[PDB]
Amino acid sequence: RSTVLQGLPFGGVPTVLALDFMCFLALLFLFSILRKVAWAIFRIKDDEIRDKCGGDAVHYLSFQRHIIGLLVVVGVLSVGIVLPVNFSGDLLENNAYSFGRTTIANLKSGNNLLWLHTSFAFLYLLLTVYSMRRHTSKMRYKEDDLVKRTLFINGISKYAESEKIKKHFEEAYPNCTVLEARPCYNVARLMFLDAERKKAERGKLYFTNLQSKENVPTMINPKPCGHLCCCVVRGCEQVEAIEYYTKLEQKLKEDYKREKEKVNEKPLGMAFVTFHNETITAIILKDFNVCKCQGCESLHISNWTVSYAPDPQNIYWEHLSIRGFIWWLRCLVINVVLFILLFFLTTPAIIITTMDKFNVTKPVEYLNNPIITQFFPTLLLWCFSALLPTIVYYSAFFEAHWTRSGENRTTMHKCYTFLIFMVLLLPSLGLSSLDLFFRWLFDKKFLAEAAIRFECVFLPDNGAFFVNYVIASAFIGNAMDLLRIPGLLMYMIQAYEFQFGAAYAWMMCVFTVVMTYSITCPIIVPFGLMYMLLKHLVDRYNLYYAYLPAKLDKKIHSGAVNQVVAAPILCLFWLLFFSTMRTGFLAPTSMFTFVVLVITIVICLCHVCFGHFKYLSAH
């Protein structure tokens, strides 16, 4: 190629931007047609959404308003200082028809402006924390004080005789009189049978209606996944409805009866104990171990662990998935299967953004096409990144959590973390390694050049698979979000709540990409800010005019706060990584970035034990 390594002209941004703009307008046209069939911006309101849809929605929109303010400050600062700074360097022998001029790759190793880059990263962390401190600390509802009157204990499974438990608690202090000490059972099996039974009665009701309307016996398929199999199947004879449900309901009824009779057995020692005067209940909790052990009735004392469970309530008939005690294996197997699917979903993105760049036996620069290697790969990646939340929620449901608040929180975090691995982590790591082995092959194929020119090593196109990604996200994702597709295309087979966890995770994946690649690719911040403004408008409209108000758990917004604090940490980590991969580990800039990261991680993990009054209020 006779000069430093080249790629697309301009990074292939204008073509994908124009085509996404055209497709975004097309999707707006289609949505307008469908809306006119049913019944700039059509309207915007403030106090109506303030009052109608509830404090939860107001809180969420306040979150995204604060993050748009954060990205405006970010964008001005970056595109004002860093972009001229990065463009001032002259490592890339200037062509000016290339993306790499704006990036961090256009900066010679040993230059002191890397200090400016890392200083900006640190200030970015500080300013994000400050902005969302101003958010969460000005409109924050307090903690609950209602149900703190009972304990959830992994107690004795021998027989869990309740009055002996009350006698023990009398020994401790008799003030907290125990109205009942109810141990749970294999309600899993019992109301699995009972839920199949209830399905049977609803089915019998609809069958009563069906053969009261038609008044004719029906030739119906009971075989699952036999919705429209009118052909003869081996051993799949279709029985008349009446004889079907009558025998099924009778069998399930007697099975449920005997099942409950043996549910009298099956201790599963997890008994609840109702208390009084929550303060003394707090004393009782303080009485128990917080793992404050060093080592070296008058019976077992170490096995009880205290907690406050009640999802509906702390009474009998508690819950269903309270089965697995040591079956983490379910959780890890589900995570591993999803992770393998995740690799197989990320791989096409890379091996479609880099087919032409594989150094062919005659590597001339006229083997490219910006459209095919930019717009299609990021469109594929965005399609997968809009399909992931559904899969993650499905898998989380099949993990069998046993606290619905816990399930929602952990599902939100899993959705965000898997989006991070599939959008930011794996593509960036893969592209960095891929370009390392590109430079190796190039500098080896050139005759006997032993020294590997680490100065000009970075992502192929110096990082433009993400500007295209964020642009495609913004346009062809807000168009779809306004179209209600992210749930309709999957559960089309009547109005619904919209899950907060999914929106938080998706908005956080995009914001994490944008804030991770501010310093090392300044041109990206305006595109992310445009994305987030359009997301704000579309969320406001969709939330107000087409969805249902409800009452979500408080701890979710704490999760959003934690995630926002997390993203600039990733920014620091990848600035460290690229400094290491460019200019060696021992270099002073890499040292100072590394020590900043270590200070940040130690102070972040210092909050769980000590209260340092500086971290942003969250989990």
Swiss-Prot record:
State which residues carry a glycan (glycosylated). 359
Residue intervals annotated with topology Cytoplasmic: 137-324, 400-403, 547-553
How is this chain modified after translation? Palmitoylation is required for localization to the plasma membrane and stability.
Cellular component terms (Gene Ontology): actin cytoskeleton; alveolar lamellar body membrane; early endosome membrane; lysosomal membrane; plasma membrane
Q: What is the effect of changing residue 481 to K?
A: Significant loss of mechanosensitive ion channel activity but no effect on its localization to the cell membrane
Top-level taxon? Eukaryota
* Transmembrane domains' residue ranges: 13-37, 55-87, 112-136, 325-354, 370-399, 404-440, 464-493, 500-518, 522-546, 554-582, 588-608
Q: Which PANTHER family match?
A: CSC1-LIKE PROTEIN 2 (PTHR13018:SF38), PROBABLE MEMBRANE PROTEIN DUF221-RELATED (PTHR13018)
Name of the protein in its database record: Mechanosensitive cation channel TMEM63B
Organism name: Homo sapiens
Query: What's the source species' lineage?
Result: Eukaryota, Metazoa, Chordata, Craniata, Vertebrata
